[PDB]
Design a protein around this ligand. Structure first.
Ligand SMILES: *[C@@H]1O[C@H](CO)[C@@H](O)[C@H](O[C@H]2OC[C@@H](O)[C@H](O[C@H]3OC[C@@H](O)[C@H](O)[C@H]3O)[C@H]2O)[C@H]1O
Ligand code: UDP
Ligand code: MN
Lengths: 299, 35
C-alpha cells in the first residue's frame, strides 16, 4: 500500500507542576485514542509543541496511552516552542500588538499565532493539519473530522467553528456603534459571532497558495483592518482569524458547532445575560466537547 | 494571559494602563463593572 498520513497538532507547554493542564491533556488524549480508528495503511501523527520539561511530561502520559486499542500506527513528533517562536516572529510581529495581552510585542506571545503561519512552519510535505486544544473531550472518531477538508469551497483555506459566547459582540463594540446595520459580532444563524480556535482545519496547501491569505499576513493589511474594526484582543490566532473573517468570510469553512461545543459561560455573567443563549445554543450530536475557561466537561 | 477587560473601551485586558474611563455593558456599574 501507499501509506496515508494524518496530522494533528497540540500545544503543550509549561506542563511541569501544572497538574490541571496534565489532567486536561489526559482527558483529551485518552478519549481521542480510545475512539480513533484508522485503516491499516494509515498513520496518525501527533505533533506536540513543547519546551523540554513538557516534552518529558507528554512522553510519560503518551506511553500509558499508546499503542491504541484500535491497533493503528501512531507517530509522536515534538516541536520546540523556542524554535517555532523564532520562525514565527518575522511573520507574526505586526499582529501581536492588536491580539496579545496586552501591549505590545513580546516573544512570549508569538506562539499563540502559530496557526496563522503554520503553512510556513510545517514541512511542505505536510499538506493539511488539524490543530486542537488539550481541554477537549472527543466523542467520536477523529478520522471523521478530516472529511470536512473535502467541503472547503474554492478560495477557503481554514476550517473553524463559531465562537459560542458574545466575546466578539463585546470586542467589536465601537465598530458596531458606528455601523448599526452590521452583522459583525451578532449571533448565529444570520450574524457573524466570530470564531473559536480550539479546533482548526489548517489546509496548509491552500493557505500557501492563496494570494488573498498571503496579503492579509502583511503588516500594512493587519494594521488597516485592525484600524477599521477598532480591534483589540488578547486571544491571539483566534482574534486574527475572527477579524479577517469579518472582512473575508470566503477564506473560512465554518464547521458545525458540534465539532467544537464550547462550555465556557464567562461572558453570560459579564454583561450579556439577555443575548447569551443566542450565541451559546448548539444542537446536534456532539462530536467534540471543549471545556474552555477551565470549565469542567460533563460525562 | 490577562483577564478580559469588562469595560467596552480601551485594551482587551482588565486594568488597561492607558484607560481612565470604564464603560460597562448594560446593568453593571463600578471601576470594573462589579455591581
Ligand atoms: C475574557 O477573560 C475571561 C477571564 O480570564 C476569559 O475566560 C475569556 O475567555 C473565554 O471566553 C471566550 C473564549 O473565546 C475563550 O476561549 C478561547 O481562548 C483562546 C483560545 O486559545 C481558545 O482555543 C479559545 O477556546 C474562553 O477562555 C476572555 O474572553
Ligand atoms: O499553559 C498553557 C496554557 C495553554 N496551553 C495550550 O493552549 C490551549 C489554550 O488554552 P486553554 O485551552 O486552557 O484556553 P481556552 O480554551 O479557555 O482558551 C490549551 O488547550 C493547551 O493546549 C498550554 O499548552 N499551556
Ligand atoms: Mn481550550
Amino acid at each position: 500500500v501507499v501509506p496515508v498520513d494524518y496530522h494533528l497538532l497540540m500545544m503543550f507547554t509549561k506542563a511541569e507542576h501544572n497538574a490541571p493542564l496534565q489532567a486536561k491533556a489526559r482527558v483529551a488524549l485518552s478519549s481521542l485514542l480510545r475512539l480513533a480508528k484508522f485503516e491499516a495503511h494509515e498513520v496518525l501523527n501527533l505533533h506536540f509543541v513543547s519546551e523540554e520539561a513538557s516534552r518529558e511530561v507528554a512522553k510519560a502520559l503518551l506511553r500509558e496511552l499508546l499503542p491504541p486499542a484500535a491497533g493503528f500506527k501512531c507517530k509522536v513528533i515534538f516541536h520546540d516552542v523556542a524554535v517555532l517562536t523564532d520562525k514565527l516572529f518575522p511573520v507574526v510581529e505586526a499582529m501581536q500588538k492588536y491580539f496579545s495581552a496586552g501591549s505590545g510585542t513580546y516573544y512570549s506571545d508569538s506562539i499563540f499565532f502559530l496557526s496563522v503561519a503554520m503553512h510556513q512552519i510545517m514541512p511542505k510535505e505536510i499538506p493539511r493539519i488539524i490543530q486542537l486544544d488539550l481541554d477537549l473531550k472527543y466523542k467520536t472518531n477523529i478520522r471523521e473530522l478530516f472529511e470536512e477538508f473535502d467541503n472547503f469551497l474554492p478560495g477557503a483555506v481554514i476550517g473553524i467553528a463559531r465562537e459560542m459566547q458574545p466575546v466578539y459582540r463585546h470586542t467589536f463594540w465601537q465598530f458596531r456603534h458606528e455601523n448599526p446595520k452590521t452583522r459583525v459580532g451578532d449571533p448565529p444563524p444570520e450574524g457573524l459571532p466570530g470564531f473559536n480556535s480550539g479546533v482548526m482545519l489548517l489546509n496548509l496547501e491552500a493557505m500557501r497558495q492563496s494570494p488573498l491569505y498571503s496579503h492579509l499576513l502583511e503588516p500594512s493589511w493587519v494594521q488597516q483592518l485592525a484600524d477599521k474594526y477598532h480591534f483589540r484582543g488578547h486571544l491571539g490566532d483566534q482574534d486574527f482569524f475572527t477579524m479577517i473573517g469579518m472582512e473575508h468570510p470566503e477564506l473560512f469553512h465554518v464547521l458545525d458547532c458540534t465539532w467544537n461545543r464550547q462550555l465556557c459561560t464567562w461572558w453570560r455573567d459579564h454583561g450579556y445575560s439577555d443575548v447569551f443563549q443566542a450565541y451559546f445554543r448548539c444542537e446536534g450530536h456532539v462530536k467534540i466537547y471543549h471545556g474552555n475557561c477551565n470549565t469542567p466537561i460533563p460525562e | 494571559q490577562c483577564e478580559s477587560n469588562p469595560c467596552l473601551n480601551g485594551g482587551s485586558c482588565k486594568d488597561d494602563i492607558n484607560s481612565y474611563e470604564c464603560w460597562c455593558p448594560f446593568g453593571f456599574e463600578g471601576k470594573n463593572c462589579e455591581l
